[PDB]
RNA sequence: UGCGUACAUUCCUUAAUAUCUGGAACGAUAGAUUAUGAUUAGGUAGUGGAACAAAAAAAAAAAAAAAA
RNA sequence: GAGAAGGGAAA
RNA sequence: GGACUCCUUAACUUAAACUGAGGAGUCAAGUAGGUACAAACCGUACAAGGAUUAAUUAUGUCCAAAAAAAA
RNA sequence: AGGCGCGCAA
RNA sequence: UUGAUAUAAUUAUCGUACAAGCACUCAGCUAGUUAUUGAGAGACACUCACGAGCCCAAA
RNA sequence: ACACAGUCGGUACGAAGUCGACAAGGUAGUUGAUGG
């Protein structure tokens, strides 16, 4: 989520809805236990809330800087381990967003810069060149050939 | 089928919301109630 | 496993005859899982330690 | 584990056992072929095949006594079960 | 289907790197009426 | 009656290998199998005694009903003819400088077109036959358009002691020009994987596969570098060029988009689908630096911690301050296992390289197939 | 001993002389095997049912000042060979460097062991060569004959006139070490897995 | 299904006609549309290669060093830059790309031994 | 669950059997709607998904 | 004397259940996922393994960090 | 230079 | 109680994608390439999945259509 | 009440 | 727009066929059910309990 | 739509300014390569 050398970060917000009481939210509650407040001393540019609804299946809601329309993304944390949801977690602080709109391949380079010394044209030389058919050779014929009645004489 | 599907997103759309009422349920009303009933009854002599 | 930390380590390291000699191999293989061992104890200490200082922080909030 | 149900016919991808072999190559009908046990074609079955044997079902018929092994006696002595200063009866 | 050509063997064009100014469409600004104020044209 | 087998082969020599036709393993037998037998004693352990025919095998043969599956064994295709490239000559590489001193071309902001005519003509002219420092250098480039063969190079792409990059002696003092050209006036092609190239200036956007181990942020360098150039000159490696390398900072580890794939083939019942989300690492190119007094890149570091080499994370360094140490500072550990790497490319693979090296780089070091 | 191998060589039609080889066979044995094979053609027809054989066959690549490489005895051209296990064999034993000029080496296609009937022979050190290409012989006589090929080369590998193996055959100090090599336990004898091939 | 529905009403999204909500005929279009996209995505690596190939063959043939020859020199020369790198430094570097064709000139266009005047006998 | 089915003797118990393992790029797909960005992509992302600009630079 | 052309488990991400892939190994408060380990993974009929199918019932929906 | 026997038309 | 190509055959008008045998290869149940165009011929380091890298397979190198003729 | 099994060794 | 590229689907069939059969489209209904009874027999059939013992019908 | 109607790709800002910009110009911000 780093741009401009590390100074601006995409993800800003982070709500996360638990069950108190609900099982599927037990892997929730150990990470809020254990791991959530290192999470949050190293990552402190993201603001973590944490909302109870007790009879709703837990979630994480991500907002990102920007209106890309891709900013927005929610993932269900029912029965997931304290692993899996720091992984989520990880995944999207490192993201710019849900990213519905990046594609793996094509020409993998974006630039504001083309050419550094200029795009190709047409030029005189070039387009003369283009019709080197036109030009007459000199067949190499190679030895001569001779009769066989001037062979024999 | 597509009926089935409609009615079980309704029905998770609901049913885990408390308050609701019997105009806001419809045809779910008795499920909820019922589903609302197990959830109290944990709290019997606490 | 440590799930309290988030700490997940599986070594599959390998000492090949071919780069370093059977006897070789052998001895670097059994050095390095001596190290681990010894590296794994340190940091259950350290854990322990940690947690400690946790607890006295999470008390001097609690005090105010 | 348990094991999973096996319904038939419901999608091309499911574990269940097939249907298409069912239609296409095997006989319609109730009873996939004639309905008997014995039936093997139009030989004869194997038991029409050999001879009978009046000894083998008179075996059977006769009535038997219970079996009883001396090691299994000489196991109930040694643990109790049975007090060999006094006559062992069949009660 | 086939044919006497060869099926993967015709080019197709595409922009061997990416850039902002793809969609960027051609339109007509405002032009001077007078051109001879400027020196090279005076 | 009896089919008599055929003796003299049309093409290739039979083969008979086992399972359906595929990709399958290839690397020759650790030791072979020498073709004549020298003694009576090898002609008669050649017998596969596993193999000795008897009457049964002869019915398997000729039975009448169903035989073996086929697709257990099949005859071998004929082998390919690969070209045999290497040895492959001492890396090496060449500057070259083709400044252009017209005032049309020459235009601060940049013309949109290179000048071919100016290519064209100089080609065949030549086939034919701190301010006062700047302007010194100007004078240099001013010299080299004058003459551009006084400008040409050649050095080695591997270190050769005291001449750094050169292949004979060190390298010209004047070729410090090189370091002051802008970044706006700097291109190159480096490998950002095992077989990706791009072509990249300052401020570009670049996607890679996967980086192990690295997050938003984190500074990377690629080394692999194989033609770098200005509008003065370009640097062709052969096949790299070795005082070059690309600063670069990733900005996300991601997954892209959903794609889903299809495919099945009619009237069969065969279809297969499924949702798939890439792995991929974006990373915005900060500088090329270019300097031929460079340095080679250290070797591998060795790391305080094995642990962290086959975790899921990095210790943080509330957990690194538990480390015991030695009266010298050097972790207790290290006397039983100093920590080298145990393969080529595990450590560059973590992350824990002065730079990334892919292999056509000579200072690269990792396994291929 | 260490076999001593002949390949007499012609350069555009004149038999321009003979150059003798010492085979490494007590370092390197399945190598040195496989080219004292290759010289002398005992092994017989091959693959494709040609000879195999070095006799009559080109040196197809040519670079002055490095190396002259040859041995194609399919092709000519670079793109055939084959060794007399199969194919293919293994790397034995990068024990020797290209320390000097003269020295025989196995060529290589792009994939990793693609060991097989072409060698090439070093007009110089090549030091960047090692740790990739088996050292397995040494020149003991025939420098001039080497000098000769090498006035046939040019740059990009084309030769001035061809230059052929026209005969070859066997008659009936060493290179740097890239390490000195030292005893190791092999639990296993060779032999046995041999008669495991064969099924004991 | 071959594909879930969803998907199915997802993919025939902008098709013509009923296509676009009968599940019956979309069904159908959604398979074809994914299985040309399967072939067509294996399929594309060629297509852009030879475009590849073409663009350098002509920039080659600019300087009168066709795309077999330019080929030859650099792989002899240890140039390993490849086609896609090649067609990119001859649209936007020429003077690069020019630089390169010398130095696969200068490997081709090799000299023998001795050359012959015969411009005056 | 392991790491890889389990096939030798000592594991060929009903109690071994089943489950699921995780994978993050397999989370993020399974049980999600899915949605096509075919008239949803804004006017300033290009279509590899990089940055688009609707104007001159010159504003 | 060349070059074009189909094929990547080179890179990255998954899967292996009729007793023989290292694993009879390394862990173990219920397996985190093997970084140059191997075999590999087209498939009709047939056979087998796994994951879903949003519901209902059950006398287990608050000992859970910080905030309120 | 050839079922070059898909179309054009080439030494 | 299958199809076609190949080898060797019996029957046929030394006919038929004819009929009937003995063996290999493909199809059947195997995509994408060549062979002009809907199985059976050639070729494959045969298709788990993704990607704008690479390789002499068959077979090509005037154009449709990728690929040589400096001085 | 009844049903199955009950070493062939020592 | 323009370039390239591609002979709906399903079933039987040696045969990837709209000159073969069904289907305008869509909603709901619509087809491997069950051994207080059978079983793991070289084309596949798991799992607990007790053990030279094991089960316990009607009532 | 040429299209079982889909699939892969798909335009690269400004100088549209101007009190502009090595060796020659006959001053055009024009020009340098080329005798059988």
Same mark, same amino acid.
């Given at each position: 989520?780093?741009?401009?050398?590390?100074?601006?970060?995409?993800?800003?917000?982070?709500?996360?809805?638990?069950?108190?009481?609900?099982?599927?939210?037990?892997?929730?509650?150990?990470?809020?236990?254990?791991?959530?407040?290192?999470?949050?001393?190293?990552?402190?540019?993201?603001?973590?809330?944490?909302?109870?609804?007790?009879?709703?299946?837990?979630?994480?809601?991500?907002?990102?800087?920007?209106?890309?329309?891709?900013?927005?993304?929610?993932?269900?944390?029912?029965?997931?381990?304290?692993?899996?949801?720091?992984?989520?977690?990880?995944?999207?602080?490192?993201?710019?967003?849900?990213?519905?709109?990046?594609?793996?391949?094509?020409?993998?380079?974006?630039?504001?810069?083309?050419?550094?010394?200029?795009?190709?044209?047409?030029?005189?030389?070039?387009?003369?060149?283009?019709?080197?058919?036109?030009?007459?050779?000199?067949?190499?014929?190679?030895?001569?050939?001779?009769?066989?009645?001037?062979?024999?004489? | 089928?597509?009926?089935?599907?409609?009615?079980?997103?309704?029905?998770?759309?609901?049913?885990?919301?408390?308050?609701?009422?019997?105009?806001?349920?419809?045809?779910?009303?008795?499920?909820?109630?019922?589903?609302?009933?197990?959830?109290?009854?944990?709290?019997?002599?606490? | 496993?440590?799930?309290?930390?988030?700490?997940?380590?599986?070594?599959?390291?390998?000492?090949?005859?071919?780069?370093?000699?059977?006897?070789?191999?052998?001895?670097?293989?059994?050095?390095?899982?001596?190290?681990?061992?010894?590296?794994?104890?340190?940091?259950?200490?350290?854990?322990?330690?940690?947690?400690?200082?946790?607890?006295?922080?999470?008390?001097?909030?609690?005090?105010? | 584990?348990?094991?999973?149900?096996?319904?038939?016919?419901?999608?091309?991808?499911?574990?269940?056992?097939?249907?298409?072999?069912?239609?296409?190559?095997?006989?319609?009908?109730?009873?996939?072929?004639?309905?008997?046990?014995?039936?093997?074609?139009?030989?004869?079955?194997?038991?029409?095949?050999?001879?009978?044997?009046?000894?083998?079902?008179?075996?059977?018929?006769?009535?038997?006594?219970?079996?009883?092994?001396?090691?299994?006696?000489?196991?109930?002595?040694?643990?109790?079960?049975?007090?060999?200063?006094?006559?062992?009866?069949?009660? | 289907?086939?044919?006497?050509?060869?099926?993967?063997?015709?080019?197709?064009?595409?922009?061997?790197?990416?850039?902002?100014?793809?969609?960027?469409?051609?339109?007509?600004?405002?032009?001077?009426?007078?051109?001879?104020?400027?020196?090279?044209?005076? | 009656?009896?089919?008599?087998?055929?003796?003299?082969?049309?093409?290739?020599?039979?083969?008979?290998?086992?399972?359906?036709?595929?990709?399958?393993?290839?690397?020759?037998?650790?030791?072979?199998?020498?073709?004549?037998?020298?003694?009576?004693?090898?002609?008669?352990?050649?017998?596969?005694?596993?193999?000795?025919?008897?009457?049964?095998?002869?019915?398997?043969?000729?039975?009448?009903?169903?035989?073996?599956?086929?697709?257990?064994?099949?005859?071998?295709?004929?082998?390919?003819?690969?070209?045999?490239?290497?040895?492959?000559?001492?890396?090496?590489?060449?500057?070259?400088?083709?400044?252009?001193?017209?005032?049309?071309?020459?235009?601060?902001?940049?013309?949109?077109?290179?000048?071919?005519?100016?290519?064209?003509?100089?080609?065949?002219?030549?086939?034919?036959?701190?301010?006062?420092?700047?302007?010194?250098?100007?004078?240099?480039?001013?010299?080299?358009?004058?003459?551009?063969?006084?400008?040409?190079?050649?050095?080695?792409?591997?270190?050769?002691?005291?001449?750094?990059?050169?292949?004979?002696?060190?390298?010209?003092?004047?070729?410090?020009?090189?370091?002051?050209?802008?970044?706006?006036?700097?291109?190159?092609?480096?490998?950002?994987?095992?077989?990706?190239?791009?072509?990249?200036?300052?401020?570009?956007?670049?996607?890679?596969?996967?980086?192990?181990?690295?997050?938003?942020?984190?500074?990377?360098?690629?080394?692999?570098?194989?033609?770098?150039?200005?509008?003065?000159?370009?640097?062709?490696?052969?096949?790299?060029?070795?005082?070059?390398?690309?600063?670069?900072?990733?900005?996300?580890?991601?997954?892209?988009?959903?794609?889903?794939?299809?495919?099945?083939?009619?009237?069969?019942?065969?279809?297969?689908?499924?949702?798939?989300?890439?792995?991929?690492?974006?990373?915005?190119?900060?500088?090329?630096?270019?300097?031929?007094?460079?340095?080679?890149?250290?070797?591998?570091?060795?790391?305080?911690?094995?642990?962290?080499?086959?975790?899921?994370?990095?210790?943080?360094?509330?957990?690194?301050?538990?480390?015991?140490?030695?009266?010298?500072?050097?972790?207790?550990?290290?006397?039983?296992?100093?920590?080298?790497?145990?393969?080529?490319?595990?450590?560059?693979?973590?992350?824990?390289?002065?730079?990334?090296?892919?292999?056509?780089?000579?200072?690269?070091?990792?396994?291929?197939? | 001993?260490?076999?001593?191998?002949?390949?007499?060589?012609?350069?555009?039609?004149?038999?321009?002389?003979?150059?003798?080889?010492?085979?490494?066979?007590?370092?390197?044995?399945?190598?040195?095997?496989?080219?004292?094979?290759?010289?002398?053609?005992?092994?017989?027809?091959?693959?494709?049912?040609?000879?195999?054989?070095?006799?009559?066959?080109?040196?197809?690549?040519?670079?002055?000042?490095?190396?002259?490489?040859?041995?194609?005895?399919?092709?000519?051209?670079?793109?055939?060979?084959?060794?007399?296990?199969?194919?293919?064999?293994?790397?034995?034993?990068?024990?020797?460097?290209?320390?000097?000029?003269?020295?025989?080496?196995?060529?290589?296609?792009?994939?990793?062991?693609?060991?097989?009937?072409?060698?090439?022979?070093?007009?110089?050190?090549?030091?960047?060569?090692?740790?990739?290409?088996?050292?397995?012989?040494?020149?003991?006589?025939?420098?001039?004959?080497?000098?000769?090929?090498?006035?046939?080369?040019?740059?990009?590998?084309?030769?001035?006139?061809?230059?052929?193996?026209?005969?070859?055959?066997?008659?009936?100090?060493?290179?740097?070490?890239?390490?000195?090599?030292?005893?190791?336990?092999?639990?296993?004898?060779?032999?046995?897995?041999?008669?495991?091939?064969?099924?004991? | 299904?071959?594909?879930?529905?969803?998907?199915?009403?997802?993919?025939?999204?902008?098709? !013509?006609?009923?296509?676009?909500?009968?599940?019956?005929?979309?069904?159908?279009?959604?398979?074809?549309?994914?299985?040309?996209?399967?072939?067509?995505?294996?399929?594309?690596?060629?297509?852009?290669?030879?475009?590849?190939?073409?663009?350098?063959?002509?920039?080659?043939?600019?300087?009168?060093?066709?795309?077999?020859?330019?080929?030859?020199?650099?792989?002899?020369?240890?140039?390993?830059?490849?086609?896609?790198?090649?067609?990119?430094?001859?649209?936007?570097?020429?003077?690069?790309? !020019?630089?390169?064709?010398?130095?696969?000139?200068?490997?081709?266009?090799?000299?023998?031994?001795?050359? !012959?005047?015969?411009?005056?006998? | 669950?392991?790491?890889?089915?389990?096939?030798?003797?000592?594991?060929?118990?009903?109690?071994?059997?089943?489950?699921?393992?995780?994978?993050?790029?397999?989370?993020?797909?399974?049980?999600?709607?899915?949605?096509?960005?075919?008239?949803?992509?804004?006017?300033?992302?290009?279509?590899?998904?990089?940055?688009?600009?609707?104007?001159?630079?010159?504003?």
């Amino acid at each position: 989520m780093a741009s401009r050398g590390g100074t601006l970060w995409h993800l800003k917000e982070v709500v996360i809805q638990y069950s108190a009481s609900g099982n599927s939210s037990q892997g929730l509650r150990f990470f809020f236990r254990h791991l959530l407040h290192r999470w949050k001393q190293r990552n402190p540019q993201v603001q973590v809330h944490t909302v109870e609804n007790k009879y709703e299946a837990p979630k994480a809601t991500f907002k990102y800087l920007g209106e890309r329309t891709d900013s927005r993304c929610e993932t269900p944390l029912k029965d997931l381990s304290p692993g899996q949801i720091e992984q989520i977690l990880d995944l999207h602080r490192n993201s710019k967003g849900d990213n519905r709109f990046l594609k793996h391949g094509g020409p993998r380079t974006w630039t504001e810069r083309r050419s550094i010394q200029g795009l190709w044209r047409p030029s005189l030389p070039s387009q003369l060149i283009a019709l080197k058919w036109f030009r007459r050779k000199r067949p190499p014929m190679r030895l001569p050939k001779y009769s066989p009645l001037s062979l024999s004489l | 089928h597509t009926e089935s599907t409609r009615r079980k997103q309704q029905y998770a759309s609901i049913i885990g919301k408390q308050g609701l009422s019997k105009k806001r349920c419809g045809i779910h009303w008795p499920r909820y109630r019922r589903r609302h009933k197990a959830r109290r009854a944990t709290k019997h002599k606490a | 496993r440590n799930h309290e930390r988030n700490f997940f380590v599986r070594c599959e390291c390998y000492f090949r005859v071919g780069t370093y000699g059977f006897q070789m191999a052998k001895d670097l293989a059994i050095r390095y899982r001596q190290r681990l061992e010894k590296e794994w104890e340190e940091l259950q200490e350290q854990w322990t330690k940690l947690d400690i200082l946790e607890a006295e922080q999470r008390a001097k909030y609690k005090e105010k | 584990k348990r094991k999973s149900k096996r319904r038939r016919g419901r999608g091309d991808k499911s574990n269940a056992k097939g249907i298409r072999w069912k239609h296409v190559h095997q006989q319609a009908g109730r009873y996939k072929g004639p309905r008997s046990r014995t039936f093997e074609g139009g030989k004869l079955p194997l038991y029409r095949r050999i001879p009978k044997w009046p000894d083998a079902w008179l075996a059977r018929q006769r009535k038997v006594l219970e079996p009883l092994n001396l090691a299994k006696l000489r196991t109930f002595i040694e643990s109790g079960r049975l007090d060999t200063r006094f006559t062992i009866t069949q009660r | 289907g086939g044919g006497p050509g060869r099926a993967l063997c015709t080019p197709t064009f595409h922009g061997l790197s990416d850039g902002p100014y793809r969609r960027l469409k051609f339109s007509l600004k405002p032009i001077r009426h007078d051109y001879r104020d400027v020196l090279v044209s005076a | 009656l009896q089919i008599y087998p055929q003796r003299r082969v049309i093409g290739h020599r039979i083969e008979i290998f086992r399972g359906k036709h595929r990709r399958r393993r290839m690397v020759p037998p650790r030791i072979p199998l020498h073709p004549l037998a020298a003694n009576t004693s090898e002609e008669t352990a050649s017998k596969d005694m596993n193999l000795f025919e008897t009457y049964r095998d002869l019915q398997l043969r000729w039975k009448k009903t169903c035989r073996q599956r086929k697709k257990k064994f099949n005859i071998a295709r004929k082998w390919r003819m690969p070209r045999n490239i290497r040895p492959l000559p001492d890396p090496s590489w060449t500057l070259v400088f083709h400044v252009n001193p017209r005032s049309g071309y020459r235009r601060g902001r940049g013309v949109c077109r290179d000048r071919r005519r100016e290519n064209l003509q100089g080609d065949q002219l030549e086939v034919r036959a701190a301010a006062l420092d700047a302007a010194i250098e100007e004078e240099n480039i001013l010299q080299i358009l004058r003459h551009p063969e006084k400008g040409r190079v050649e050095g080695s792409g591997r270190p050769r002691g005291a001449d750094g990059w050169g292949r004979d002696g060190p390298l010209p003092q004047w070729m410090q020009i090189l370091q002051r050209t802008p970044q706006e006036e700097l291109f190159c092609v480096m490998k950002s994987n095992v077989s990706t190239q791009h072509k990249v200036t300052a401020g570009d956007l670049i996607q890679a596969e996967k980086l192990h181990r690295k997050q938003a942020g984190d500074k990377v360098v690629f080394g692999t570098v194989m033609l770098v150039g200005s509008r003065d000159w370009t640097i062709i490696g052969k096949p790299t060029v070795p005082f070059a390398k690309v600063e670069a900072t990733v900005e996300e580890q991601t997954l892209a988009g959903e794609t889903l794939s299809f495919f099945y083939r009619k009237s069969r019942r065969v279809s297969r689908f499924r949702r798939i989300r890439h792995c991929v690492t974006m990373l915005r190119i900060d500088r090329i630096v270019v300097d031929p007094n460079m340095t080679v890149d250290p070797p591998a570091p060795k790391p305080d911690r094995l642990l962290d080499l086959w975790a899921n994370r990095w210790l943080y360094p509330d957990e690194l301050d538990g480390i015991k140490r030695n009266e010298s500072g050097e972790p207790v550990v290290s006397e039983i296992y100093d920590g080298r790497e145990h393969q080529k490319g595990s450590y560059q693979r973590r992350g824990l390289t002065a730079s990334y090296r892919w292999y056509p780089d000579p200072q690269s070091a990792h396994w291929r197939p | 001993p260490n076999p001593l191998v002949h390949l007499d060589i012609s350069i555009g039609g004149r038999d321009a002389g003979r150059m003798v080889f010492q085979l490494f066979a007590d370092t390197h044995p399945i190598t040195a095997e496989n080219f004292r094979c290759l010289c002398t053609g005992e092994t017989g027809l091959g693959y494709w049912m040609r000879p195999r054989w070095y006799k009559s066959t080109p040196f197809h690549r040519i670079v002055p000042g490095f190396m002259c490489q040859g041995g194609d005895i399919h092709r000519g051209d670079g793109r055939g060979g084959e060794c007399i296990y199969g194919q293919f064999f293994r790397d034995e034993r990068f024990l020797y460097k290209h320390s000097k000029r003269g020295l025989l080496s196995m060529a290589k296609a792009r994939r990793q062991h693609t060991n097989n009937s072409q060698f090439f022979i070093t007009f110089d050190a090549c030091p960047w060569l090692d740790g990739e290409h088996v050292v397995f012989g040494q020149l003991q006589s025939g420098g001039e004959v080497l000098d000769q090929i090498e006035e046939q080369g040019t740059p990009g590998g084309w030769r001035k006139r061809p230059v052929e193996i026209w005969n070859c055959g066997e008659l009936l100090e060493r290179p740097e070490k890239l390490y000195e090599p030292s005893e190791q336990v092999i639990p296993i004898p060779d032999d046995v897995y041999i008669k495991a091939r064969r099924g004991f | 299904m071959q594909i879930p529905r969803d998907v199915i009403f997802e993919v025939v999204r902008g098709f !013509r006609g009923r296509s676009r909500n009968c599940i019956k005929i979309a069904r159908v279009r959604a398979m074809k549309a994914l299985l040309y996209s399967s072939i067509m995505r294996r399929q594309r690596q060629r297509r852009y290669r030879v475009f590849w190939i073409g663009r350098i063959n002509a920039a080659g043939r600019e300087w009168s060093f066709p795309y077999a020859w330019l080929a030859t020199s650099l792989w002899r020369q240890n140039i390993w830059l490849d086609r896609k790198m090649l067609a990119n430094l001859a649209e936007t570097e020429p003077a690069s790309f !020019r630089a390169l064709v010398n130095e696969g000139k200068s490997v081709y266009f090799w000299n023998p031994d001795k050359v !012959r005047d015969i411009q005056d006998l | 669950i392991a790491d890889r089915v389990r096939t030798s003797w000592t594991y060929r118990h009903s109690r071994y059997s089943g489950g699921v393992r995780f994978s993050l790029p397999r989370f993020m797909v399974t049980k999600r709607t899915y949605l096509s960005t075919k008239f949803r992509r804004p006017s300033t992302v290009t279509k590899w998904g990089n940055p688009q600009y609707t104007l001159p630079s010159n504003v």
